[PDB]
Design a protein around this ligand. Structure first.
Ligand SMILES: c1ccc(Cn2cnc3ccccc32)cc1
Ligand SMILES: c1ccc(Cn2cnc3ccccc32)cc1
Lengths: 141, 135, 138
């Protein structure tokens, strides 16, 4: 004990970005995890549960189809290795509103100093109507 | 173990509601967590892993499905929320998952809610639950 | 002696099965494709499975994932956690559908937990950090 954990939420006031915040109520950084250049920094080696959710919302279907992506990536200290951990793609269009959440999660072996990022392609479709709809977090097992 | 924990399941005999049940097998409340007015009451300050799952089931497409966990510290403030559009007479199944690590205080009341209990699927045990685990 | 724990992963060479591979701490033994509880207590049970299909054959494509308890006292299979998914809602596009399961349960010495799927033909042994099963004693 005690286990490194983090749960960061998107800043709804940050236009055209997916900006992670830990300095708002119901968001945290604990036992060594850090938020640096919009990335979570792993404090110690071990098995981590990495999780993320983004809610996309559009107002109808415009010309052809829109692609929505959400990716979690890991940049390591050794060899500055840039690996891609979890990724998902969605085509919401096939004027009434649509809602498309993207979930990303898994158990990974991480090392001290690994920097994890949770990114999207279209921040214009990001939904911040209410709180708790878009978050990113890691839990040490 | 001294760690406060809870794993509550939906009552399949509750009409048009998502009613959490604790003492109805494989479900529990431990080390101070109490189930009051369909809310889990946090017994002590600390880091908690909050989790939830709801399974929605419809028969064809005639619709928005939502599932929210909210905190009321000692008006609800959403911790975790998700929205799903299952319709874009074959049946559809749509699970909604909610979870994360939160800093909670003694007396905080957590609720796990849905907008349409008519689409809720509890035909099988283990298909709709809500719990908290102290870290 | 400290805290029984386990994290198993699907065997990528076992085609047509969800076979859990070992390498399991402080007594949590994977005995018959099942995790065997070594002592009484509160356990956090977790699981994930990734499904992948090549297109849509019909809307009758049902995907399930279930964690079951076979209690050492009664000896009957009961669902602890379960979830169902309908991935199918021309040049067929591949689809990916993960299923997540987890919770805190009171388990007894000898209890056997299994993590099963209905269609192993749709299982995607490619992501790895995505098809797993584990328990952590609290
Ligand atoms: C406890 C309750 C539920 C869960 C659900 N869960 C299982 N693997 C996951 C990966 C990412 C996010 C959630 C995940 C885990 C632990
Ligand atoms: C992916 C899958 C599930 C989720 C939401 N989620 C449900 N149980 C969880 C337990 C721990 C963390 C996240 C969890 C988010 C992203």
């Amino acid at each position: 004990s005690d286990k490194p954990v983090a749960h960061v939420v998107a800043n709804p006031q940050a236009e055209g970005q997916l900006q992670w915040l830990n300095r708002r109520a119901n968001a945290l950084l604990a036992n060594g995890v850090e938020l640096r250049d919009n990335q979570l920094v792993v404090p110690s080696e071990g098995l981590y549960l990495i999780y993320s959710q983004v809610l996309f919302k559009g107002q109808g279907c415009p010309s052809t189809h829109v692609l929505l992506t959400h990716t979690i990536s890991r940049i390591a200290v050794s060899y500055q290795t840039k690996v891609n951990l979890l990724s998902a793609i969605k085509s919401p269009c096939q004027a009434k509103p649509w809602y498309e959440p993207i979930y990303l999660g898994g158990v990974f072996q991480l090392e001290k100093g690994d920097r994890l990022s949770a990114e999207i392609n279209r921040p214009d479709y990001l939904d911040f109507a209410e709180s708790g709809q878009v978050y990113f977090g890691i839990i040490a097992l």
